[PDB]
């Protein structure tokens, strides 16, 4: 059908900078493209329609251009209230509308070194029958940090899940919690659980490790 | 009174082969799309360029009604940016088509106990068709270096292949009647409106 | 000045039916078409179906075509959304949106706040909370609210007295169908045994309130 | 077997210019290539044999060169009497001789804008049962003009045939007649027949159109 | 000073046989080999077969090998070309050509004027002529000579009085096997009703002469 | 006395599927490799990084014993620089592995008259595994453009395929138990020695 | 009297396999091509470099008569610029060959009720033959990385494959005897003339 | 498994020159590579182990470097006693060790034009039933010379065999003997046996030919 | 100062067994592992099998795994190599080599002189010598020692008087399983009939001595 690619996936920008976002389609559409804005949690909001028309009540800093397959949305001077996720949506396919993947804009601050912590399962969960391990990353910037779980120095994938907090209002740094889980029979079968972290702000990878039932 | 005769198109007793896609011209008549809205027997109903809803409040210079027959699997192929036998050798659309497409099975009508072979399709052509091009040339295709001097055989094939339509055929292989309703609006008075 | 009110959202087992209501205000609901847009948790927007201004033309997305229903009552300025035989894929947030009619192509002018709909073949279950204590330059502790259904759950630290540094991680629906959530708070390493820390959580749908103490690991 | 490609297919040249024609073979032949000249209607005539030998009674302006696969025929100074079609023929395959596709040389004049006309079938042909439409191009240069038939604004291909007159002796411009034909049942089934023309001398395509039985 | 005379060309139904004659003059027909070259309408040259100077060595093209025959009579300086079981593909113009013997490789030194051969399973049919009138900066008119067989046909304007601007389009063999031809002539738009225009055509093989008036479309 | 329990690994009654490659950790025990030397029933015994002979005179920080089951044809695949189903989707080695690999048929034990299907293998994965990566995710693979929403069918496949092991299976198709013995020596005291 | 013995070549009772293409040398004798001219039983007779007609009026230093056996389909392959099994692995021509080629079916003679397998052909070779190269080496071809140490089996094939010639074989599969008559003229006296 | 490629296959060098030899593996090995030296006829000898360790009693001119897949052995100043064949062997695969193909180093002298001779079978071999033809190349440099056998001007391959003498101690030129053999029935069936030679020192190919039983 | 002595090499029919001995000296044979390396004629090295210092660990190459045997007697400082059911592929030169033990990876420190082993299902056969005379700027003559088995054979010119310019080509094992060798010597073209040339060859295993005269071809 039709697919829309929005770039970059996420960008860091500060106040007063000129931001540009590109949206590309599988095939050509003359001017059947729209730009919308949606804050975290808040409902979606319109910014630009037709790719070349400013919506009423929208600041003039937003400008749209492009035709065919590639379109651009540009902000002459960024503002604190503009830090939201922007969607680009095509309209050529009325009855099979599709939207862009989204582009979340964060505040371009200094690089924050993650604070990494490890926490073993509680004996109460041991009673239940399951086991869960928590690897915490706090106050890091940007959000692009790789978290890897090691079981007895063995890489494990897919058995945990990560959750990222929104950019903080105070220091504009993120927090990540990785929960590595398995059953009781699968927990004692191994001895060492370690959480390696790779981040831009780390000169070397940092891993927190422990041994089962040792404290 | 001055209503566009869309019924004779959709209620036509007989249709044409895809390579010989039948066309009708609609002009100087009232544009009543209610028949589409009431008709719930549409297997597929997909529009592009303009929404089907706010159409009866909109005028155009002319309307073109294309009709043909394909199989179920080829239904997806009737659209811009589509590729396949039907897409390139039997029917085509531009990159800026403006209109609607409708498709519905006609197995009860376009199938026979002995197989309905009346409908055919082009299977070979040395170049892809131009947009909205109709080709019914009976030229023998040259598939090899040896020229085909009006005779069939080695590297010489009949351009048309007949469809196999029977009541027992699969959904993707049962016949389907397909219509393309295209609206054109130029710098000329529009003689058709809702 | 446009006001839209989604309502009727809730939770139900798969295969059932649900009715959703959008209330129009400060505009002619009768003279514009309406669209329904759903957005799954963490994903983006997804078009569903659209109805004309006059309610005579109906269209739906292929993913739900022949499964949903869209209707409106211009006399009441109300928009009705019926969803029969719902699947687990239908868990998302729904919004109602105006047509706009400014072009032959559909854009989206205004949106409501939206309402939440969830599908799951599971009963409500009491949450289980577990402490997340630090060990031996500050430290941090937390609580895990795991195995609770459905959303949401309310979490506080020191009955709300502990505010700074508190981060309540977004919940996630695990393969078992339940939800798990992590709450964390960083404290200086100096104060670990003197100040007592108790995570206070309430779950109104299940009518459960639990206050769990957290103490550093000892061995 | 062996195939011979002669380039260009057709070229425009004026008197006094130096013309070059290339002929290429599928495989290598030492000197087994010949160049012949043939005027329109007149019988074929020899110019060069062996690719490096001037034929007796042939003007010295014709010169041949090349060996293996590629051969060239060059005219130092073109003359009015030299405007003919030149064939290049290989000789390595005695018992399966093959000739080139031909290269017709026209007079390099100014660009002539086609004069385009449309003519519907006569009622006499309507009585017969067939129907034919004539699209006429006259006094155009060069001959490379696309003629497209539209039935109710629908492109049709293969149902007509084009015939091109030779380059004129007076103004050196060509004439083309396209006859679009079908049966009586197929004629009234449509309403509009139009003949679009695309030519180098046309800033925009020109189409002549009419409506059935309206005059 | 070399003279060659092709003869015996004509028209016949497919599967029949035809004999063609080339008469040699002003050279030793006995001391050179002979080739037959055929050229289809609008196409280029096509080699067929070759005979030695002494008439003992014979060779033919694969397309006709085992179907044609080449023979010569040096006493008469005559070259004979027999074509048995002819196909529609054989419609073309044939030429006779000298060997030359200047190299171990065959070139072509001299050619005759050639004779025409046609194959078609159709009888001679009377031509049908139709007017091609202009409408409403000059104008142009013409006549179409369609559905006639075989070639050729003679066309004139105003019984030959109208010469300038006249273009007689080359004929083409349509799928029905017949021929159609278009004749055109441009005239100033001022003179359209005063001067009468009549295309005069004669077809000697069918013994048909027709003079058709052309008048501008009226409505 | 403080001998490493390698026997329970090689004499384990039951093994795991390759995608779920079982692991054992060996530390703070005496390194007795005589069992390998005495045991002549090894189908394949190939080491890399260090010779098997001068090992009982050498210490390491830790030992990792990997165990799984494959077919005979896949025996060659258990090695660095190897490619194949087992190489990329079920088990992997680095470009600097240091240890040994052992393989032996277990057809008498790991085959059934009705076919031993207890052992499975990953057949699809959108990316090659990282070195020493274990993946047992039950995610349905997306093979086509259409997303697989937790359901199987078109372009939606179960990631695990069960092996067909029978007494009559071919040598390359009969089950084989495979072990990887890896020795790690860091800037830490070595608690295992000969 | 001093006539070249072409008859013993064309009327030879037996022929050779293509890979072992038999050769005859013709020198110091009268060049009588009448046998070719009279003989109308030639399936194919195609010359290159010089016309067959004006040959008995032409001298050369030497003549080489190549003879072998192929199938009907391979007849086309005996020519310069040809590709195929026979073209590259069993017989070859330069880009400047000067001579003639003759071919005729010998199914009545070179076929058996049980199949005539006496004639063979090379099917593999690590490099294409040089012009007019004869190769009859019995080396086993190395098709895989594993060297073939004089033994057949995996990636080790016998270079020769025997033809299947029977009275019932197809035209392209029935045997054909092929001759190459090459004329060489150097800066030396020509001892053969018409 | 593992394959080792050593380059060049053979090189010409003089005394005092700095020689470099490269050895490449299918995959990566850290330092598990060795260099050994072996004179013609003499048993193999070690030069370098681990690719970065000089063996005791070995001249310092030999130096090793490289890791992973590519390794180099370099001689700062060549000596007459160093002219031997060098093998590079990997050690990462203890139980499937493999060695390099070998690199024989000859003395870089002036180009020597081969002296070519032809010798027919003796009548004594004719009595036996076999037939053998000898083509001799002597005093040529380098050893890279193509010897081709022609039977009646027909190229023959695989039916003979070549034997190359070691580099000479006096003039450092090689000798080659090609023995072309067949049976009695196969010898008289042809007339001319010729041995064409192609060598770097030959401006044109040189062939020695004869006719059966003519002397 | 390390001395190794291979012994026990010889020739035998395929499928038989052979024992090879390596004698150690000037080092502790007991405290190092041993490898066996074989090198085919004209090829390079090929690893076979290895034994520990203590003789308890054994390993062999796949090409011979389960076919060879390696054992040692440290009391005698002797290394034993038994090869049962030998194939024609086993014809090569074997060497014994020390372990070195300087790394966790095996290198080769010292080698013996090696011993020769051959496999062939053929009996010893008397050599056949044939002269290689020149014809009509110097000339050259030679002798061919063909159809002899096994190696080696000794060749001289003029009973050793003729030394300069003599080249004894390496032998080669032909498909028949026998050996052939060529010996050559260049002489000035002036001296061809005066000086007599006789190639003197001896084959001790077959106990055959032949002196063959060479004279220029005469006709
Ligand atoms: C077409 O036929 C159907 C019944 O087959 C009928 O209901 C419909 O009204 C017809 N179409 C029109 C435009 O009347
Ligand atoms: C494993 O079992 C075998 C017999 O099945 C036995 O010989 C061997 O000693 C056992 N392994 C150990 C370490 O004892
Ligand atoms: C070869 O044999 C045919 C009959 O089989 C005979 O006619 C011909 O003359 C023979 N060839 C010659 C050169 O005599």
PDB file of N, CA, C and O in Angstrom, chain H residues 56-102:
ATOM      1  N   UNK H  56      65.850 -19.483  19.069  1.00  0.00           N
ATOM      2  CA  UNK H  56      67.255 -19.454  19.444  1.00  0.00           C
ATOM      3  C   UNK H  56      68.108 -20.061  18.339  1.00  0.00           C
ATOM      4  O   UNK H  56      67.711 -21.027  17.681  1.00  0.00           O
ATOM      5  N   UNK H  57      69.289 -19.486  18.135  1.00  0.00           N
ATOM      6  CA  UNK H  57      70.175 -19.943  17.085  1.00  0.00           C
ATOM      7  C   UNK H  57      69.772 -19.520  15.693  1.00  0.00           C
ATOM      8  O   UNK H  57      70.343 -20.025  14.721  1.00  0.00           O
ATOM      9  N   UNK H  58      68.810 -18.612  15.566  1.00  0.00           N
ATOM     10  CA  UNK H  58      68.344 -18.145  14.264  1.00  0.00           C
ATOM     11  C   UNK H  58      68.856 -16.725  14.053  1.00  0.00           C
ATOM     12  O   UNK H  58      68.801 -15.908  14.983  1.00  0.00           O
ATOM     13  N   UNK H  59      69.364 -16.383  12.868  1.00  0.00           N
ATOM     14  CA  UNK H  59      69.867 -15.023  12.656  1.00  0.00           C
ATOM     15  C   UNK H  59      68.779 -13.982  12.867  1.00  0.00           C
ATOM     16  O   UNK H  59      67.599 -14.214  12.596  1.00  0.00           O
ATOM     17  N   UNK H  60      69.199 -12.815  13.356  1.00  0.00           N
ATOM     18  CA  UNK H  60      68.267 -11.740  13.668  1.00  0.00           C
ATOM     19  C   UNK H  60      67.606 -11.146  12.433  1.00  0.00           C
ATOM     20  O   UNK H  60      66.612 -10.425  12.574  1.00  0.00           O
ATOM     21  N   UNK H  61      68.121 -11.424  11.235  1.00  0.00           N
ATOM     22  CA  UNK H  61      67.527 -10.855  10.031  1.00  0.00           C
ATOM     23  C   UNK H  61      66.091 -11.318   9.822  1.00  0.00           C
ATOM     24  O   UNK H  61      65.314 -10.606   9.176  1.00  0.00           O
ATOM     25  N   UNK H  62      65.715 -12.478  10.357  1.00  0.00           N
ATOM     26  CA  UNK H  62      64.343 -12.958  10.273  1.00  0.00           C
ATOM     27  C   UNK H  62      63.491 -12.254  11.321  1.00  0.00           C
ATOM     28  O   UNK H  62      63.842 -12.234  12.504  1.00  0.00           O
ATOM     29  N   UNK H  63      62.374 -11.677  10.882  1.00  0.00           N
ATOM     30  CA  UNK H  63      61.448 -10.992  11.771  1.00  0.00           C
ATOM     31  C   UNK H  63      60.020 -11.341  11.383  1.00  0.00           C
ATOM     32  O   UNK H  63      59.693 -11.419  10.195  1.00  0.00           O
ATOM     33  N   UNK H  64      59.175 -11.544  12.390  1.00  0.00           N
ATOM     34  CA  UNK H  64      57.786 -11.910  12.187  1.00  0.00           C
ATOM     35  C   UNK H  64      56.849 -10.863  12.757  1.00  0.00           C
ATOM     36  O   UNK H  64      57.165 -10.202  13.750  1.00  0.00           O
ATOM     37  N   UNK H  65      55.688 -10.716  12.123  1.00  0.00           N
ATOM     38  CA  UNK H  65      54.692  -9.745  12.555  1.00  0.00           C
ATOM     39  C   UNK H  65      53.341 -10.144  11.976  1.00  0.00           C
ATOM     40  O   UNK H  65      53.245 -11.026  11.120  1.00  0.00           O
ATOM     41  N   UNK H  66      52.298  -9.480  12.459  1.00  0.00           N
ATOM     42  CA  UNK H  66      50.949  -9.734  12.006  1.00  0.00           C
ATOM     43  C   UNK H  66      50.152 -10.561  13.001  1.00  0.00           C
ATOM     44  O   UNK H  66      50.693 -11.328  13.802  1.00  0.00           O
ATOM     45  N   UNK H  67      48.833 -10.396  12.943  1.00  0.00           N
ATOM     46  CA  UNK H  67      47.926 -11.123  13.820  1.00  0.00           C
ATOM     47  C   UNK H  67      46.575 -11.245  13.133  1.00  0.00           C
ATOM     48  O   UNK H  67      46.278 -10.529  12.174  1.00  0.00           O
ATOM     49  N   UNK H  68      45.762 -12.168  13.640  1.00  0.00           N
ATOM     50  CA  UNK H  68      44.444 -12.393  13.084  1.00  0.00           C
ATOM     51  C   UNK H  68      44.467 -13.369  11.929  1.00  0.00           C
ATOM     52  O   UNK H  68      44.534 -14.583  12.135  1.00  0.00           O
ATOM     53  N   UNK H  69      44.418 -12.847  10.707  1.00  0.00           N
ATOM     54  CA  UNK H  69      44.454 -13.669   9.506  1.00  0.00           C
ATOM     55  C   UNK H  69      45.726 -13.501   8.696  1.00  0.00           C
ATOM     56  O   UNK H  69      46.214 -14.483   8.132  1.00  0.00           O
ATOM     57  N   UNK H  70      46.283 -12.297   8.635  1.00  0.00           N
ATOM     58  CA  UNK H  70      47.437 -11.997   7.800  1.00  0.00           C
ATOM     59  C   UNK H  70      48.681 -11.890   8.666  1.00  0.00           C
ATOM     60  O   UNK H  70      48.673 -11.204   9.695  1.00  0.00           O
ATOM     61  N   UNK H  71      49.744 -12.570   8.249  1.00  0.00           N
ATOM     62  CA  UNK H  71      51.029 -12.517   8.926  1.00  0.00           C
ATOM     63  C   UNK H  71      52.122 -12.305   7.891  1.00  0.00           C
ATOM     64  O   UNK H  71      51.981 -12.697   6.730  1.00  0.00           O
ATOM     65  N   UNK H  72      53.214 -11.683   8.323  1.00  0.00           N
ATOM     66  CA  UNK H  72      54.333 -11.379   7.444  1.00  0.00           C
ATOM     67  C   UNK H  72      55.628 -11.878   8.060  1.00  0.00           C
ATOM     68  O   UNK H  72      55.839 -11.763   9.272  1.00  0.00           O
ATOM     69  N   UNK H  73      56.489 -12.439   7.218  1.00  0.00           N
ATOM     70  CA  UNK H  73      57.856 -12.770   7.584  1.00  0.00           C
ATOM     71  C   UNK H  73      58.784 -11.944   6.711  1.00  0.00           C
ATOM     72  O   UNK H  73      58.647 -11.942   5.482  1.00  0.00           O
ATOM     73  N   UNK H  74      59.721 -11.244   7.341  1.00  0.00           N
ATOM     74  CA  UNK H  74      60.577 -10.302   6.638  1.00  0.00           C
ATOM     75  C   UNK H  74      62.037 -10.593   6.944  1.00  0.00           C
ATOM     76  O   UNK H  74      62.397 -10.904   8.082  1.00  0.00           O
ATOM     77  N   UNK H  75      62.869 -10.485   5.913  1.00  0.00           N
ATOM     78  CA  UNK H  75      64.312 -10.656   6.022  1.00  0.00           C
ATOM     79  C   UNK H  75      64.934  -9.318   5.658  1.00  0.00           C
ATOM     80  O   UNK H  75      64.808  -8.864   4.517  1.00  0.00           O
ATOM     81  N   UNK H  76      65.610  -8.683   6.617  1.00  0.00           N
ATOM     82  CA  UNK H  76      66.154  -7.351   6.370  1.00  0.00           C
ATOM     83  C   UNK H  76      67.193  -7.380   5.256  1.00  0.00           C
ATOM     84  O   UNK H  76      67.186  -6.525   4.361  1.00  0.00           O
ATOM     85  N   UNK H  77      68.093  -8.360   5.291  1.00  0.00           N
ATOM     86  CA  UNK H  77      69.153  -8.499   4.299  1.00  0.00           C
ATOM     87  C   UNK H  77      69.307  -9.974   3.963  1.00  0.00           C
ATOM     88  O   UNK H  77      69.684 -10.771   4.828  1.00  0.00           O
ATOM     89  N   UNK H  78      69.021 -10.332   2.716  1.00  0.00           N
ATOM     90  CA  UNK H  78      69.078 -11.729   2.310  1.00  0.00           C
ATOM     91  C   UNK H  78      70.520 -12.221   2.264  1.00  0.00           C
ATOM     92  O   UNK H  78      71.454 -11.458   2.003  1.00  0.00           O
ATOM     93  N   UNK H  79      70.693 -13.514   2.524  1.00  0.00           N
ATOM     94  CA  UNK H  79      71.995 -14.157   2.493  1.00  0.00           C
ATOM     95  C   UNK H  79      71.934 -15.402   1.623  1.00  0.00           C
ATOM     96  O   UNK H  79      70.861 -15.987   1.440  1.00  0.00           O
ATOM     97  N   UNK H  80      73.072 -15.830   1.072  1.00  0.00           N
ATOM     98  CA  UNK H  80      73.056 -17.026   0.216  1.00  0.00           C
ATOM     99  C   UNK H  80      72.515 -18.258   0.915  1.00  0.00           C
ATOM    100  O   UNK H  80      71.830 -19.070   0.280  1.00  0.00           O
ATOM    101  N   UNK H  81      72.797 -18.425   2.203  1.00  0.00           N
ATOM    102  CA  UNK H  81      72.336 -19.595   2.937  1.00  0.00           C
ATOM    103  C   UNK H  81      70.848 -19.554   3.242  1.00  0.00           C
ATOM    104  O   UNK H  81      70.292 -20.572   3.669  1.00  0.00           O
ATOM    105  N   UNK H  82      70.193 -18.416   3.035  1.00  0.00           N
ATOM    106  CA  UNK H  82      68.774 -18.282   3.318  1.00  0.00           C
ATOM    107  C   UNK H  82      67.893 -18.732   2.162  1.00  0.00           C
ATOM    108  O   UNK H  82      66.670 -18.791   2.321  1.00  0.00           O
ATOM    109  N   UNK H  83      68.478 -19.053   1.013  1.00  0.00           N
ATOM    110  CA  UNK H  83      67.704 -19.457  -0.158  1.00  0.00           C
ATOM    111  C   UNK H  83      67.145 -20.849   0.097  1.00  0.00           C
ATOM    112  O   UNK H  83      67.792 -21.866  -0.156  1.00  0.00           O
ATOM    113  N   UNK H  84      65.920 -20.886   0.609  1.00  0.00           N
ATOM    114  CA  UNK H  84      65.222 -22.133   0.872  1.00  0.00           C
ATOM    115  C   UNK H  84      63.731 -21.886   0.698  1.00  0.00           C
ATOM    116  O   UNK H  84      63.299 -20.783   0.349  1.00  0.00           O
ATOM    117  N   UNK H  85      62.943 -22.925   0.946  1.00  0.00           N
ATOM    118  CA  UNK H  85      61.494 -22.820   0.903  1.00  0.00           C
ATOM    119  C   UNK H  85      60.968 -22.603   2.315  1.00  0.00           C
ATOM    120  O   UNK H  85      61.348 -23.323   3.243  1.00  0.00           O
ATOM    121  N   UNK H  86      60.100 -21.609   2.471  1.00  0.00           N
ATOM    122  CA  UNK H  86      59.548 -21.239   3.766  1.00  0.00           C
ATOM    123  C   UNK H  86      58.090 -21.664   3.845  1.00  0.00           C
ATOM    124  O   UNK H  86      57.304 -21.377   2.936  1.00  0.00           O
ATOM    125  N   UNK H  87      57.739 -22.346   4.930  1.00  0.00           N
ATOM    126  CA  UNK H  87      56.371 -22.757   5.203  1.00  0.00           C
ATOM    127  C   UNK H  87      55.804 -21.926   6.345  1.00  0.00           C
ATOM    128  O   UNK H  87      56.500 -21.646   7.326  1.00  0.00           O
ATOM    129  N   UNK H  88      54.539 -21.532   6.213  1.00  0.00           N
ATOM    130  CA  UNK H  88      53.799 -20.884   7.286  1.00  0.00           C
ATOM    131  C   UNK H  88      52.687 -21.816   7.736  1.00  0.00           C
ATOM    132  O   UNK H  88      51.894 -22.287   6.914  1.00  0.00           O
ATOM    133  N   UNK H  89      52.633 -22.080   9.039  1.00  0.00           N
ATOM    134  CA  UNK H  89      51.720 -23.063   9.599  1.00  0.00           C
ATOM    135  C   UNK H  89      50.931 -22.445  10.740  1.00  0.00           C
ATOM    136  O   UNK H  89      51.503 -21.779  11.610  1.00  0.00           O
ATOM    137  N   UNK H  90      49.624 -22.682  10.738  1.00  0.00           N
ATOM    138  CA  UNK H  90      48.755 -22.215  11.805  1.00  0.00           C
ATOM    139  C   UNK H  90      48.718 -23.230  12.938  1.00  0.00           C
ATOM    140  O   UNK H  90      48.969 -24.422  12.741  1.00  0.00           O
ATOM    141  N   UNK H  91      48.391 -22.746  14.134  1.00  0.00           N
ATOM    142  CA  UNK H  91      48.342 -23.586  15.317  1.00  0.00           C
ATOM    143  C   UNK H  91      47.030 -23.497  16.081  1.00  0.00           C
ATOM    144  O   UNK H  91      46.857 -24.230  17.061  1.00  0.00           O
ATOM    145  N   UNK H  92      46.108 -22.629  15.668  1.00  0.00           N
ATOM    146  CA  UNK H  92      44.845 -22.492  16.385  1.00  0.00           C
ATOM    147  C   UNK H  92      44.089 -23.813  16.426  1.00  0.00           C
ATOM    148  O   UNK H  92      43.375 -24.099  17.394  1.00  0.00           O
ATOM    149  N   UNK H  93      44.227 -24.626  15.384  1.00  0.00           N
ATOM    150  CA  UNK H  93      43.548 -25.917  15.309  1.00  0.00           C
ATOM    151  C   UNK H  93      44.551 -26.998  15.681  1.00  0.00           C
ATOM    152  O   UNK H  93      45.232 -27.570  14.829  1.00  0.00           O
ATOM    153  N   UNK H  94      44.632 -27.287  16.978  1.00  0.00           N
ATOM    154  CA  UNK H  94      45.645 -28.210  17.474  1.00  0.00           C
ATOM    155  C   UNK H  94      45.517 -29.582  16.825  1.00  0.00           C
ATOM    156  O   UNK H  94      46.507 -30.158  16.363  1.00  0.00           O
ATOM    157  N   UNK H  95      44.307 -30.122  16.785  1.00  0.00           N
ATOM    158  CA  UNK H  95      44.095 -31.492  16.344  1.00  0.00           C
ATOM    159  C   UNK H  95      43.830 -31.611  14.851  1.00  0.00           C
ATOM    160  O   UNK H  95      43.606 -32.724  14.365  1.00  0.00           O
ATOM    161  N   UNK H  96      43.839 -30.502  14.119  1.00  0.00           N
ATOM    162  CA  UNK H  96      43.696 -30.503  12.668  1.00  0.00           C
ATOM    163  C   UNK H  96      44.684 -29.528  12.050  1.00  0.00           C
ATOM    164  O   UNK H  96      44.357 -28.735  11.167  1.00  0.00           O
ATOM    165  N   UNK H  97      45.923 -29.582  12.531  1.00  0.00           N
ATOM    166  CA  UNK H  97      46.960 -28.684  12.047  1.00  0.00           C
ATOM    167  C   UNK H  97      47.036 -28.704  10.527  1.00  0.00           C
ATOM    168  O   UNK H  97      46.791 -29.728   9.886  1.00  0.00           O
ATOM    169  N   UNK H  98      47.367 -27.551   9.955  1.00  0.00           N
ATOM    170  CA  UNK H  98      47.558 -27.410   8.523  1.00  0.00           C
ATOM    171  C   UNK H  98      48.726 -26.470   8.271  1.00  0.00           C
ATOM    172  O   UNK H  98      49.006 -25.572   9.070  1.00  0.00           O
ATOM    173  N   UNK H  99      49.404 -26.686   7.151  1.00  0.00           N
ATOM    174  CA  UNK H  99      50.587 -25.928   6.784  1.00  0.00           C
ATOM    175  C   UNK H  99      50.325 -25.127   5.517  1.00  0.00           C
ATOM    176  O   UNK H  99      49.374 -25.379   4.774  1.00  0.00           O
ATOM    177  N   UNK H 100      51.193 -24.152   5.274  1.00  0.00           N
ATOM    178  CA  UNK H 100      51.102 -23.372   4.062  1.00  0.00           C
ATOM    179  C   UNK H 100      51.530 -24.165   2.842  1.00  0.00           C
ATOM    180  O   UNK H 100      52.105 -25.248   2.933  1.00  0.00           O
ATOM    181  N   UNK H 101      51.233 -23.602   1.671  1.00  0.00           N
ATOM    182  CA  UNK H 101      51.606 -24.252   0.428  1.00  0.00           C
ATOM    183  C   UNK H 101      53.092 -24.216   0.145  1.00  0.00           C
ATOM    184  O   UNK H 101      53.583 -25.036  -0.638  1.00  0.00           O
ATOM    185  N   UNK H 102      53.809 -23.292   0.757  1.00  0.00           N
ATOM    186  CA  UNK H 102      55.241 -23.177   0.576  1.00  0.00           C
ATOM    187  C   UNK H 102      55.605 -22.025  -0.339  1.00  0.00           C
ATOM    188  O   UNK H 102      54.853 -21.646  -1.244  1.00  0.00           O
TER     189      UNK H 102
END
